Amino acid sequence: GGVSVQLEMKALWDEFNQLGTEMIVTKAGRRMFPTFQVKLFGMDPMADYMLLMDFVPVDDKRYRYAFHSSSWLVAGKADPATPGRVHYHPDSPAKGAQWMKQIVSFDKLKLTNNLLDDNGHIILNSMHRYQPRFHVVYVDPRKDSEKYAEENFKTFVFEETRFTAVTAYQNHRITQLKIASNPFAKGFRD
Amino acid sequence: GVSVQLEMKALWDEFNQLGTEMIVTKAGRRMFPTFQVKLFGMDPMADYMLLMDFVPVDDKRYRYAFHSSSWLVAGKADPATPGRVHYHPDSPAKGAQWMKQIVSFDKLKLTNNLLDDNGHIILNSMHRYQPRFHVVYVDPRENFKTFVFEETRFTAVTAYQNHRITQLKIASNPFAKGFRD
DNA sequence: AATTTCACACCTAGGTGTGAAAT
DNA sequence: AATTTCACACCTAGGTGTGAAATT
């Protein structure tokens, strides 16, 4: 367990977290912003690794945004859990030297509210809080089967990456930051 | 017992009849048409490596004569370019994975820069090349098969010589739609 | 020269939030 | 109501040939 992970764009994640991060969710699938990007350290260069991402609920409560007080409040009890989906990195599996070579970005990752989705996108319930988790798994390609044991995986949880899944932005301050930092939203600047 | 089917065969043969030309730039240029294949007779449990390589057709330099609208031998071929091993991005993969859908080499770029380090194929302008496709059976400790489609042979150029080639590239490549009509 | 390189307009492809409309 | 979906304009990103200019 000597593998180290460094979250890229930490300052941007913390700026969003202070406001209370919101992530748009659609039927077709929406990319996260900011993109979850990491730097890998202490891996064996000859060993083959699988890089994974999963989303875990923060609490069992449904949220509501009050525009009068500009804050999030508990609306009621959480809706039933969404069918569990996982997202492997497109380059997985790959050698330890390949992962440590450059920053690993989960830019192809998409969030959806469609419970019946078959496009490999992450299914999330709108107005609920989620915690993105990052997993490094050691895998032997000569073996046709894979499973989880205590010594074959490591989980990395960055508290600043937690967000609320929404269909439209609630906090206007979040929209302002998304517009100002995401290049695809440059047409809305000024 | 492995069988390979060249996709877009009709488009390749139409280009070959005119004498296929591929643009070559410093930055790297995609081939048009894209080399796409269908795999058959592979073992679904066996691991395979899929490769692409370019071999010179002859040891001659070519020149296009606009008066007669034909290719002629200009002189002797330039020295061979620095060759490297080119694997499909998904290689290695199981036999069932390769046979599942059409295999394409769309991210494949041709360059005339001898000092290139971006993993692109280095070629000499005004020379005839033959693209070859390889299927290699991964063994823990013959397995090497080569598929050569004669219709995929082309002349590497910096600018199109035959106006008929340009016309076909414009008419069939979606990125050249702005030049239609 | 005869051949090669450059900025450029114009495509494809797909990622943005907007504000109306819909549920 | 409070929340979700739709067409849309406007971006980024990157693949085209064009015609001018340049070039061991």
- Cβ atoms of residues B126 and B157 within 8 Å: yes
Question: Which nucleotide lies closest to B29 by the C1' atom and the CA atom?
Answer: D15
A8-45 burial code (b ≥16 CB/10 A, e <16):
ebeeebeebeeebbbbbbeeebbebbbebbbebeebee
Which is nearest to A131 in space by CA: A159, A111, A104? A159
Q: By three-state DSSP, how is residue B173 classified? A: coil
Three-state SS at B15:
helix
Closest nucleotide to B173, Cα to C1': D16
Chain C nucleotides near the protein (CB, 7 A): 2-6, 9-20
Q: How far is the CA of B87 from the C1' of D24 (A)?
A: 34
Residues by Cβ under 7 A, strand D: A 26-27, 64-65, 75, 113, 126-127, 166-168, 183-184, 186-187; B 23, 29-30, 32, 159-160, 166, 169-170, 173, 175-176, 178-179
B176/C12 CA-to-C1' distance in Å: 10
Closest nucleotide relative to residue B64's CA, C1' based = C2
Nearest to A122 by CA among A49, A32, A9: A32
What's the CA A4/C1' D19 distance, rounded, in angstroms? Answer: 54
For residue A65, give the nucleotide whose C1' atom is nearest its CA: D2
- CA distances, B142 to each of A52, A180, B2, B50 (Å): 37, 59, 12, 15
CA of B179 to C1' of D18 (A): 9
Spatial separation of the C-alpha atoms in residues A183 and B6, rounded to whole Å: 40
Query: Which tokens go with B28?
Result: 């790297």
Contacts of A38 (CB under 8 A, 6+ apart): A5, A6, A7, A8, A103, A104, A105, A134, A156
Question: What is the greatest pairwise CA distance in chain B?
Answer: 59
List chain D nucleotides near protein: any atom < 7 Å from a Cβ.
Answer: 2-6, 9-20
Integer distance in angstroms from CA B154 to C1' D17? 19
Contacts of A25 (CB under 8 A, 6+ apart): A111, A112, A113, A124, A126, A165, A166, A167
Question: Is B110:B121 a contact under the CB 8 Å cutoff?
Answer: yes
Q: Which residue is closest to C12 in terms of CA–C1' distance?
A: B175
Resolution value (Å, 1 decimal): 2.6
Distance A22 CA to C15 C1' (A): 17
Nucleotide C16 C1' to residue A189 CA (A): 11
Give me the DSSP letters along B79-135: PPP-----B-TT-SEEHHHHHHS-EEE-S-EEE--TT--SSPEE--TTEEEEEEEEE
Amino acid at B161: Q
- Distance separating alpha carbons of residues B149 and B131, to the nearest angstrom: 8
Question: Which is it for the CA torsion A25, A27, A29, A30, positive or negative?
Answer: negative
| Residue A66: nearest nucleotide (C-alpha to C1') | D2
In chain B the domains, ranked by start, together with CATH numbers, are 1-181 (2.60.40.820)
Taking the CA of residue A103 and the C1' sugar atom of nucleotide D12, their distance in angstroms comes to: 21
The spacing between the Cα labelled CA in B27 and the C1' in C5, in angstroms, equals: 11
Which residue approaches D19 most closely, CA to C1'?
Answer: B159
Distance B174 CA to C14 C1' (A): 16
Residues with CB under 7 A from strand C: A 24, 30-31, 33, 168-169, 175, 178-179, 182, 184-185, 187-188; B 25-26, 63-64, 74, 112, 125-126, 157-159, 174-175, 177-178
What's the 3-state SS for chain A? Answer: CCCEEEECCHHHHHHHHHHCCEEECECCCEECCCCCEEEEECCCCCCEEEEEEEEEECCCEEEEEECCCCEEEEEEECCCCCCCCEEECCCCCEEHHHHHHCCEECCCCEEECCCCCCCCCEECCCCCEEEEEEEEEECCCCCCCCCCCCCCEEEEECHHHCEEEECCCCCHHHHHHHHHHCHHHHHHCC
Amino acid type, B155:
T
